[PDB]
Design a protein around this ligand. Structure first.
Ligand SMILES: [Zn+2]
Ligand SMILES: [Zn+2]
Ligand SMILES: [Zn+2]
Ligand SMILES: [Zn+2]
Ligand SMILES: [Zn+2]
Ligand SMILES: [Zn+2]
Lengths: 117, 117, 117, 117, 117, 117
């Protein structure tokens, strides 16, 4: 009934393979992505934390490193790297290392994002 | 399971008619409104999208074009143009042409708003 | 269902008493905190408001005045003033004087927060 | 050289009377304006300030009063309330009571502004 | 004197060819770029403007459409697309069509940019 | 010529000890500060940079680690930690190790700050 969240940003290149022929999103293009990891459980009586942040950064780092300053399409499972797919992919990578993960949000621009539960 | 949202902003004038006599919100005034449209449903296996963003831009244009750089009180329904009523009004114009709309959020200033579901 | 929310910022010092000895969060430090108060209920058909912002500002001021330009550890209950605890603590001061309160959000930095419902 | 700046926002209705017939700016609209007041001068060796802020807030207050939650065009000197006009008008009102003011910046939208000196 | 500025954002891929072997910036990556164009000139007595905003949108359009949703390295003059080269290149495409232009600010990420001229 | 800027944030405590009896700024308090370092110089013909953004972090690291998650009053030179004094103090710590530094900006809150050259 308490939730935490943490934002990270990464710089990346991608393109959408399944859009019609002219579409601007089929060009190779890039963005400053924002990812929000959201976490839900009990507040620890001694530490007063649901989770240490240094834990959360450590458990995300392997996945973060694959995304940042990379080309998304070269990453297995991101063959079609829209926000929807990216956020599912991210959940799939993070959830088995962060059991208390309750949601992933991805934002490609400042005016548009996607949330996966 | 998956949600998407898209943010727009318009510049309009409004004033509240039902506040007490000298209240600042009863004077002719303006804001940079932000509106957020939230969509929920199935991710298409092939496009990797819930909805094309261009369908949405197009289905909101007419309602948008009515709000932007206008005086709100002169639009039928926006007689009492608080944030609450305005989010409800946008939902009401928008839900018929975007069946997957799951929420409307209105912000009048950067420090306050309202969400209608 | 309609939800309102208002955002406030205060400047404050704190430190965490229960982290291990090296840790940077055990040092005397501070932040620009953000508290989001969120309210749920019925829109008044006459005023077009779930609540008047003036009643909200007035009901939170006592709590705000305690938090702002202060050292958080010196407030009873905020002895371990993390986000999770800061937010439960704000809910307990505010729920009694704002019965439609539905959530409290606290952010310490721009990239990390906590929500209590 | 040392410079201070302070940012204020106000909400306000306006319209531009000298744009052509169709033009959307010639329709009654509003924005959330941002004004930045910039001040240059000696730092006092004892207080470490160029100026007390409360002395800037109090010296701006009467100009800020006339602008916040008002229709700009009713204000003499603002009959044509473009950004360039509105920043030169604020300097004309503030400069006499803050003789260290060195610039005034007005923004109407988050992406556009104007600087007068 | 008076100064105007207008901000644009474009989404794009690039990478640096002249950085050391392993350097992250030599991978294909991208950013959400910010470009600020700054204009300096006389305010016209009758319109109250330095320059019509959409006279400026229309004049940046061909330079903008080439940068947006594109791969910076394919464009002639941007074979080494650093901030500093980007900014001067934007200058060189725009200056000839916007005589009053007085500065180009390019930003690659929220916390880093460069100003030419 | 060309200017680079890079922004950093740190989380600190302070209090001013030279303000009158009651003043809110004389109480132990904190902010999320922001510091912009600004650098001016030749763009290198081959690298297309003025300075390497990595040589800047390394040279600033020792100063940033003294300010971050600390109480500013304990640091010599910051006896009276106003924005103005702090900006000047950052200049004096950084200029010897970054000779192309041309300005330092400090922001205590999102709505106020100070530039030193
Ligand atoms: Zn994209
Ligand atoms: Zn209003
Ligand atoms: Zn802290
Ligand atoms: Zn306008
Ligand atoms: Zn880059
Ligand atoms: Zn302070």
């Amino acid at each position: 009934s308490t939730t935490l969240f943490k934002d990270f940003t990464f710089e990346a290149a991608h393109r959408l393979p399944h859009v019609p022929e002219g579409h601007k999103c089929g060009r190779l293009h890039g963005h400053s992505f924002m990812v929000r990891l959201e976490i839900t459980g009990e507040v620890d009586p001694h530490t007063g934390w649901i989770i240490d942040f240094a834990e959360l950064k450590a458990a995300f780092k392997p996945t973060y490193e694959r995304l940042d300053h990379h080309y998304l399409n070269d990453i297995p499972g991101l063959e079609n790297p829209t926000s929807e797919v990216l956020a599912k992919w991210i959940w799939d990578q993070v959830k088995p290392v962060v059991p208390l993960l309750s949601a992933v949000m991805v934002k490609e621009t400042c005016t548009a994002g996607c949330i996966y539960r």
